[PDB]
């Protein structure tokens, strides 16, 4: 149903919230009352209309297929290239993942994308990540890997990953400090 402003613009008249509500209730009753074409033609005048994008698969100079993707987390940006056939090796900035991310938490984050669609050991990965700390970098690599792996998984798998949150960019970034208060939310200790 159009908004009250849309109705007001149609009628070049000023309305009220309750006027709009009454009109919408009347239109709802009209719709429910088996409105025929002779009625639906009128009804539609007040009706206003209302999935992950899979990246293309490229082929290296040696002909092996891969998918490239990018992902940002906090202040860390990662670019990931996932090969169609691989032994699970992951090279981050030229360093193997267990050496780049000595933290079990970060290695778990790296595992999560592949483990979800049950493809551990199937794809090799090359990531270049810069900015942010270890956790932010791990998250960015996770996002990039999930986005790349979308191309190599089925559509149902892609939708499942989305519903699992692998494919959504974490919008949480540090809040700017405000003048006159200690932190973003911390205020100076009040002195009664």
């Amino acid at each position: 149903w159009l908004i009250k402003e849309e109705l007001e613009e149609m009628l070049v008249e000023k309305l009220s919230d309750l006027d709009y509500m009454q009109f919408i209730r009347l239109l709802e009753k009209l719709l429910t009352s088996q409105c025929g074409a002779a009625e639906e033609e009128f009804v539609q005048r007040f009706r206003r209309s209302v999935k992950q994008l899979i990246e293309p698969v490229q082929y290296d100079e040696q002909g092996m297929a891969f998918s490239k993707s990018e992902g940002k987390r906090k202040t860390a940006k990662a670019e990931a290239i996932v090969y169609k056939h691989g032994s699970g090796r992951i090279k981050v900035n030229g360093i193997d993942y267990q050496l780049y991310f000595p933290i079990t938490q970060d290695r778990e984050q790296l595992m999560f994308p592949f483990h979800f669609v049950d493809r551990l050991g199937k794809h090799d990965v090359t990531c270049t990540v810069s900015g942010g700390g270890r956790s932010a970098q791990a998250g960015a690599i996770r996002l990039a890997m999930a986005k790349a792996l979308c191309s190599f998984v089925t559509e149902d798998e892609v939708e499942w990953m989305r519903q699992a949150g692998l494919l959504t960019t974490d919008p949480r970034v540090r809040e700017r400090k405000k003048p006159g208060q200690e932190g973003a939310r911390r205020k100076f200790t009040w002195k009664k």
């Binding site: 699970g88 360093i95 193997d96 993942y97 267990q98 050496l99 000595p102 079990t104 290695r107 778990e108 595992m111 592949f114 483990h115 049950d118 551990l120 050991g121």
Partner: protein, 349 residues
């Protein structure tokens, strides 16, 4: 898991399968130098099984084909952190002990270059410093390891300790060892005497020597020991490090200088430094040159499966999901087949 427990017969046929160590052998050969986590694992399981791996097997091949006439060869185990270099050295040490060599075992040269509360001045050379506590500890461990050869081996010099006390030519090396252990102040001098006597007598065919040094990179690095005037101390000033460097020269024959680099516990080295030059520096690499580097890499899939099966059979992996293939894959990923990482993970898993 092998029915083969003799450390000489096993080979590639036994690669990827376990090799047991009896409690008596563990107590005698290995009173020190085994990784602390492996010591804990042995304590828990009541057993000491080391997987047979290509690095250890290759080092065993070299030591079996070693010609004692030729100058003693230097073997250097290197690899990424936690690849099992120390335990491979221990496996070769056990093999040599069973072949009845004399095992001059340095559990970790890093300990000798840092965190020393008692740093006195050598009486034999006033320009060198003593590390009596560590000297005495290593002397006790060496006595335990090589008691049987200790009495049989004799000294060939006169070794003064005090202005009135000394040891006379023909005295068993056990006399020197006892002097060093009981008299802590003389531990450094006793260690030097022991190294010198072993080095000279190995060329005389009295026995076959195996100088097994873990964390060899420490000798030619920097030390965190500061003089009384807060002055930094270089390794050579430490008599122990100086004598060990002397031992680390191929000038003699009748034995093998086996050693392992170990970034863990190193000083002024980045975490990822694992190659020989990266861990040794110009001085260390030149000193060890020529040498045979041996690469110890993470578990290959067969070895990884064998280790997982070992833990499962011991019942260590308590998590109900550990036996499943999904659990195995998750462990494999989270450890990248690295021995130390896998052990630590399975500890709490």
């Amino acid at each position: 898991r092998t029915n083969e427990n003799d450390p000489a017969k096993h080979g590639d046929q036994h690669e990827g399968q376990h090799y047991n160590i009896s409690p008596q052998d563990l107590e005698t050969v290995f009173p020190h130098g085994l990784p602390p986590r492996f010591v804990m694992q042995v304590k828990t399981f009541s057993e000491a099984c080391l997987m047979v791996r290509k690095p250890a097997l290759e080092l065993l091949h070299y030591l079996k084909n070693t010609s004692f006439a030729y100058p003693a060869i230097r073997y250097l185990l290197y690899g990424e952190k936690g690849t099992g270099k120390t335990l491979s050295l221990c496996h070769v040490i056990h093999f040599c002990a069973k072949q009845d060599w004399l095992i001059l075992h340095i559990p970790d040269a890093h300990l000798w270059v840092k965190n020393c509360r008692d740093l006195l001045q050598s009486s034999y050379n006033k320009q060198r410093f003593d590390q009596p506590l560590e000297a005495s500890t290593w002397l006790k461990n060496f006595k335990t390891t090589n008691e049987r050869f200790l009495n049989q081996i004799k000294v060939q010099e006169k070794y003064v300790w005090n202005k009135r006390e000394s040891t006379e030519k023909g005295s068993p090396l056990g006399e020197v060892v006892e002097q060093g252990i009981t008299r802590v102040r003389n531990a450094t001098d006793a260690v030097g005497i022991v190294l010198k006597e072993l080095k000279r007598q190995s060329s005389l065919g009295m026995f076959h020597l195996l100088v097994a040094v873990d964390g060899i990179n420490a000798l030619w690095g920097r030390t965190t020991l500061k003089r009384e005037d807060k002055s930094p101390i270089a390794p050579e000033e430490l008599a122990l490090v100086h004598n060990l460097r002397k031992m680390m020269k191929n000038d003699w024959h009748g034995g093998a200088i086996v050693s392992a680099l170990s970034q863990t516990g190193s000083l002024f080295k980045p975490r990822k430094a694992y190659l020989p030059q990266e861990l040794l520096g110009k001085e260390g690499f030149d000193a060890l040159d020529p040498f045979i580097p041996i690469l110890v890499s993470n578990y290959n899939p067969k070895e990884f499966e064998s280790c997982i099966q070992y833990y499962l059979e011991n019942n260590w992996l308590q998590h109900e999901k550990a036996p499943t293939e999904e659990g195995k894959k998750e462990l494999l990923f989270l450890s990248n087949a690295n021995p130390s990482l896998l052990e630590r993970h399975c500890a709490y898993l």
